[PDB]
Write a protein that binds this DNA or RNA. Structure first.
Length: 314
DNA sequence: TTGTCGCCCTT
DNA sequence: TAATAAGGGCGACA
């Protein structure tokens, strides 16, 4: 994986474009098959044959913020997507332990890291909010879970509203009713009398990483799971409620819309970067809608988990 | 003795 | 559209 430097359709071994590579160099095969976007500068193209480019990183260049941007081949992306099946199943098998951890700690002291993590984990499994790295709060004013501040928590005598601007300037509103098990512990954690402070003031990126490590997943996996679970809940409800029934094609489209709105991102992004491919393939089958119809949601969730488990050949 | 930071990869 | 932005995860650094 030698680094080669790109400039105006031709390739060099040199930082400042003296000394061009060989004419027959395999990298030129790659350049026939991909277009370097012209908004980039300092473009590096990796010397390899097209067939190997397919499978991994292809080139990287700097956008106008000065950020390094990374471009991958179609096989790399395919493997990426194929992983969502296993993640969905993986999270599903640790939910019982996650809840167990949550409920052990939510009766604890207000400034206990474990109590704070418990709440963190319960907001996450409830609303699928992104991790919220400090970095993006400084750079872009983006708030996610870890970067939530007391000003983002509005208290009413019957509900708590969490309101904040997340990724891509998208505005989010989540609501916690009195009956919700998040009410009591969230009201206890937040301090009205200092709005400029972080909600999870005893946590940090490192604390979260260490804590989640025990379930063998990453916070983003909780979000990937939440999107699939919500899809399944809506799909199940839709089949269960909607006048005779539309085509599976349109039933998936509706379920994806509903799910995307709950989660708060576009339908296209939901289908493409979140949904387990097997679920998407499984639900197309018309005969399968008979199966769904006669089930409680729990036995439905199980059928899907099982099929994804074993169609994944594991 | 821990809060940034770069690199890679994801959305 | 057609052009191409901004998130997370992990480990090194002082």
């Amino acid at each position: 994986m030698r680094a080669l430097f790109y400039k105006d359709g031709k390739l060099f071994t040199d930082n400042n474009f003296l000394n061009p590579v060989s004419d027959n160099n395999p990298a030129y095969e790659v350049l026939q098959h991909v277009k370097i976007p012209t908004h980039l500068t300092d473009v590096v193209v990796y010397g390899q044959t097209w067939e190997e480019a397919l499978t991994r990183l292809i080139f990287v260049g700097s956008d106008s913020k000065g950020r390094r941007q990374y471009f991958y081949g179609k096989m790399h992306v395919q493997n990426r997507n194929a992983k969502r099946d296993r993640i969905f199943v993986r999270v599903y098998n640790v939910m019982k332990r996650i809840n167990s951890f949550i409920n052990k700690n939510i009766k604890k002291s207000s400034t206990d890291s474990n109590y704070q993590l418990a709440v963190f984990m319960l907001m996450e499994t409830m609303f699928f909010i992104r991790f919220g790295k400090m970095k993006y709060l400084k750079e872009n004013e983006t708030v996610g879970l870890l970067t939530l501040k007391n000003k983002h928590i509005e208290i009413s005598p019957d509900k708590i509203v969490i309101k904040f601007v997340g990724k891509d300037k998208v505005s989010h509103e989540f609501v916690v009713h009195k009956s919700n098990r998040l009410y009591k512990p969230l009201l206890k954690l937040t301090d009205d009398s200092s709005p400029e402070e972080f909600l999870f003031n005893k946590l940090s990126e490192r604390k979260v990483y260490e804590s989640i490590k025990q379930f063998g997943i990453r916070i983003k996996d909780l979000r990937t799971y939440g999107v699939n679970y919500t899809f399944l809940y809506n799909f199940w409800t839709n089949v269960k409620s909607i006048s005779p029934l539309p085509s599976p094609k349109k039933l998936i489209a509706l379920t994806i819309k509903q799910t995307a709105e709950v989660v708060g991102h576009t339908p296209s992004i939901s289908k493409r970067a979140y949904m387990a491919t097997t679920i998407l393939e499984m639900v197309k089958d018309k005969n399968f809608l008979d199966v769904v119809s006669k089930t409680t949601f729990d036995e439905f969730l199980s059928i899907v988990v099982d099929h994804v488990k074993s169609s994944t050949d594991g």
